[PDB]
């Protein structure tokens, strides 16, 4: 009985920005879902494919953890449906999702006193994303019919925009840390099983 390292993802000191969400594999474990549900620190624990109270007897071939940091308001855009902006340009969920989303407030940690800069979010893309596609590339993006000569003067705006994350805003704007678990039962021997 060798438990699996979830503590290395939820207690991460920092969380990647939204447009470059971290994507970690997990395999060859006995995953303990008891802690992840009973905990009193989360503020949004949701599961779509399988209700939380029966995760102790479902063996998956593989499991992935996505991790990032989003605005407090926009946490209502991480869902199969419920499209919008962030789910439209940065991280889109597949429609037949079988997984869970865990979002909790981190007002104290991820917000500095004078104004942070390490967190950026995408804007001004050519077309809406497709499920799970990661686009970390930065290229100067055009607005209208204008030759893009590396010039950003009303011709091609730089996509990424910077979060402020001031420590004195209302509850609707302080950062929220999000971890999305995705389960996979591909044709292969069961690699992980709760006890």
């Amino acid at each position, epitope marked *: 009985t060798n438990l699996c*390292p979830f*503590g*290395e993802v939820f*207690n*991460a*000191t*920092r*969380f*990647a920005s939204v447009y470059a969400w971290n994507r970690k594999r997990i395999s060859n474990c006995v995953a303990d879902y008891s802690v992840l549900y009973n905990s009193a620190s989360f503020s949004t624990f949701k599961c779509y494919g399988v209700s939380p109270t029966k995760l102790n007897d479902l063996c998956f071939t593989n499991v992935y953890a996505d991790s990032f940091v989003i605005r407090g308001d926009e946490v209502r855009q991480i869902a199969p449906g419920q499209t919008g902006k962030i789910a439209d340009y940065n991280y889109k969920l597949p429609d037949d999702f079988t997984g869970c989303v865990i979002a909790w407030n981190s007002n104290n940690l991820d917000s500095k006193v004078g104004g942070n800069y*390490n967190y950026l979010y995408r804007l001004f893309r050519k077309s809406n994303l497709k499920p799970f596609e990661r686009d970390i590339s930065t290229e100067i993006y055009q607005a209208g019919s204008t030759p893009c000569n590396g010039v950003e003067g009303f011709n091609c705006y730089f996509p990424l925009q910077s979060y402020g994350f001031q420590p004195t805003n209302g509850v609707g704007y302080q950062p929220y840390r999000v971890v999305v678990l995705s389960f996979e039962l591909l044709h292969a021997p069961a690699t992980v099983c709760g006890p």
Partner: antibody
Amino acid sequence: QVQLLESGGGLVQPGRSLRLSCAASGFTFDDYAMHWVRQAPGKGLEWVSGVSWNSGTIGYADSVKGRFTISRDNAKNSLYLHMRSLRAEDTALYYCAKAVEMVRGLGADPEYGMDVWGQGTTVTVSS
Amino acid sequence: DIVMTQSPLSLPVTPGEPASISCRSSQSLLHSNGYNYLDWYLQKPGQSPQLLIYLGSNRASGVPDRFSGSGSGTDFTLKISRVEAEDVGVYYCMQALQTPFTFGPGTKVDIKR
């Protein structure tokens, strides 16, 4: 064996940009918090910037804040430092160092211990 | 925004004579864990610097047992019991508590005559 190779040096006029790159080879690249430390010509060291295990920056030096921009890539085992709006006072060597404690190996996460150091470049600025 | 100091500023040492150096801070680095976060670093003449001591006194890996670290609060010291011909250069003390980190002005150790 552990190697830390940096590149990007060369004469650059004031008011331009540069992109230094440090590549690590010989350990779990994503299992150490990297740091970028300057070294003035014939003077003492000076901390410049850093990055933790999960690509989360840990702040820059007080006198440099506003221009430097650090970034990390675990897939290609690389650590980049973009520099903009230079002045004549930013000529120095630059080392990229590694932390000692592996994350989750024992309170908080570790950041100290700049143990292994590559041979720095020789960035300079003048007109 | 924490400023250190070191003493003595520059001292001449002679092989076979113990060495002592003091690093002082502004805010005591005692963390909630009870660990001081000061680190002691060495630089040889003409090479990249190297680590000497981390976590206050915890001896670093690969260095001989001729170095000692002590102190707490706002005062820490490094003592070289048996100095030799390969212990010349510059010494620095670095904080790890409140970012940004900082390096001391540096102590210059050389051979006396």
